[PDB]
Design a protein around this nucleic acid. Sequence first.
DNA 1: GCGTAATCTAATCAACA
DNA 2: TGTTGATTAGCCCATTACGC
DNA 3: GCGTAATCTAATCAACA
DNA 4: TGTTGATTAGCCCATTACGC
Lengths: 132, 132
Amino acid sequence: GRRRRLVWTPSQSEALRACFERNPYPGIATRERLAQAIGIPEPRVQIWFQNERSRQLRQHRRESRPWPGRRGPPEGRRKRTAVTGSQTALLLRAFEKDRFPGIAAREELARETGLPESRIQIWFQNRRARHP
Amino acid sequence: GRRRRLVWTPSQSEALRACFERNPYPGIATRERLAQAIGIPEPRVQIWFQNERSRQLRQHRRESRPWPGRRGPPEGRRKRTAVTGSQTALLLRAFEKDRFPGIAAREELARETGLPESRIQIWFQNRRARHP
DNA sequence: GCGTAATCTAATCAACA
DNA sequence: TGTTGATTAGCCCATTACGC
DNA sequence: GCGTAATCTAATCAACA
DNA sequence: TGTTGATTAGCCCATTACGC
């Protein structure tokens, strides 16, 4: 069971497109600034940019048009989430049970740990990658 | 269980390519003439030409080069196989049991009917298409 | 069924102990 | 420096499944 | 796993009753 | 003319699965 996909409003989609033309590699500050402007969580904005770039990369390559890329200084990343030893212990127990937690499983770990669900999702991605 | 694919010899592949450059839409006479020259049944030759054309069509389209097509008068088709009423009755019974007979099932129908297995395969193709 | 948000892997950047 | 959280790309014309 | 023979559908040509 | 045997093409850049 994956996350119930969300439906952008017309005005939300315009703000995403506009900010994407301004800079298609926004930092955490930009994303949070946009997230708060349009009323959806920053993790959703991050995903949209990742998908939009992938959509644009696929298109520029079909048009045989070169892809501009990272224009301007790279914006600041997210702060490296600090995860305590106990928080880790819960993820390890959740991981041996199910490597692929759904949105239901992830959202409960975010209660049992206090970690943002978005970060828990990334933790499992990295874990699955580094522990076959 | 599908037919055990066959492996062309180098000299067989050259004769196929050569005849394909001569005419990529050979009639039954040409195919049988080539089949007997290289030592594999005409149904195999027919399949090869059908696949080779499909391979060539996919390539010319990637190269943006136009596909020549049927050059010269169209060569004669195969004689419309005559199928008796009893032969049909066996195919209908085999069809209600299994719409997708394998090579094992088809090769036995060719004994129980006297029809070429290649024609039995075509019969099922047409039947499945016209009787959902 | 289409559009695409959600998801995934493999690699690489990069903070922190 | 190792570990691990963070970010990014993802590359083309029926489909299926065997022999090599 | 790659190359591709084997297979498939949907449509269309075409013989025969 | 209907039925059915015969022949041909097959159309593009991570994958999955939901909301519309």
